[PDB]
Every structure is written in structure tokens, then in C-alpha cells.
Design a binder for this molecule. Structure first.
Ligand SMILES: CCNC(=O)C[C@@H]1N=C(c2ccc(Cl)cc2)c2cc(OC)ccc2-n2c(C)nnc21
Length: 109
């Protein structure tokens, strides 16, 4: 339970305006329709976003902290898989990932 509460803090920071500069692209779920990505569903089968992860935490969907990280990492994996390695969005993803990996690890046991 205590560990689960920490997840909310880490995710909350990612939404802050401190990382919003390179974490805004991970705020809402990728709209294959709005964005016009007619090849996102074929590549990405299990999509995920920060907004979704936040809702799951509110509904106590996650059992442990480990599960919470699985979704966070999956969100970045889909980006690295869909978009190319020389893509700007990729550079921003690595920045947010580092902030999550550090906080997630620095989390009190
Ligand atoms: C760029 C090729 N086609 C795309 O739409 C890829 C898409 N690319 C973008 C994107 C990123 C930066 C710019 Cl300048 C233009 C488009 C994107 C834009 C979004 O705004 C609604 C949300 C998620 C995105 N995203 C993420 C996250 N990973 N790949 C993409």
C-alpha cells in the first residue's frame, strides 16, 4: 500500500511543468485517428499513456509497484518501436524515462 502511494508521486512529477517540456507528448493516449497514424495499431498492440496509468492507480488496478513500472516502461517501448531512433520524440522519452527510473529506484522500501 505504502509503495503504491509513492507511484502517484513519481507520476505526478512527470506531469509537472518541470518535465512537461519533454513529457507533454506522453500526456494523452496517441490518437491513431486524430494524429493520422494508420500504422500505429499494426505495430503497437498494447498501447499506454500517462493519463491511462493515472486512472488505473485511482481505481486501485495495480497490485504492486512492480506492475506500475511495467506500464510506464511499456509506454516508452511503444515509442521506440513505432518512431525511429533518430526521432525527436525519442530524445524526449529518454529524458522522462531517466526521471522515472531514478525516482522509482530511489523509492523508499
Ligand atoms: C511523426 C510520425 N507520426 C506520428 O504521429 C508519430 C507520433 N508523433 C508525434 C509528434 C511529435 C512531435 C511533433 Cl513536432 C509532431 C508529432 C506525436 C504527437 C502527439 O500529439 C498529439 C502525440 C504523440 C506523438 N507521438 C509519440 C509520443 N510517439 N510517436 C508519436
Amino acid at each position: 500500500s505504502e509503495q503504491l502511494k509513492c507511484c502517484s508521486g513519481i507520476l505526478k512529477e512527470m506531469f509537472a511543468k518541470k518535465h512537461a517540456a519533454y513529457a507533454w507528448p506522453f500526456y494523452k493516449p496517441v490518437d491513431v485517428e486524430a494524429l493520422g497514424l494508420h500504422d500505429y495499431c499494426d505495430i503497437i498492440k498494447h498501447p499506454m499513456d500517462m493519463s491511462t496509468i493515472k486512472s488505473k492507480l485511482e481505481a486501485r488496478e495495480y497490485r504492486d509497484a512492480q506492475e506500475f513500472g511495467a506500464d510506464v516502461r511499456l509506454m516508452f517501448s511503444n515509442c521506440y518501436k513505432y518512431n525511429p531512433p533518430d526521432h525527436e520524440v525519442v530524445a524526449m522519452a529518454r529524458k522522462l524515462q531517466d526521471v522515472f527510473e531514478m525516482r522509482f529506484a530511489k523509492m523508499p522500501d
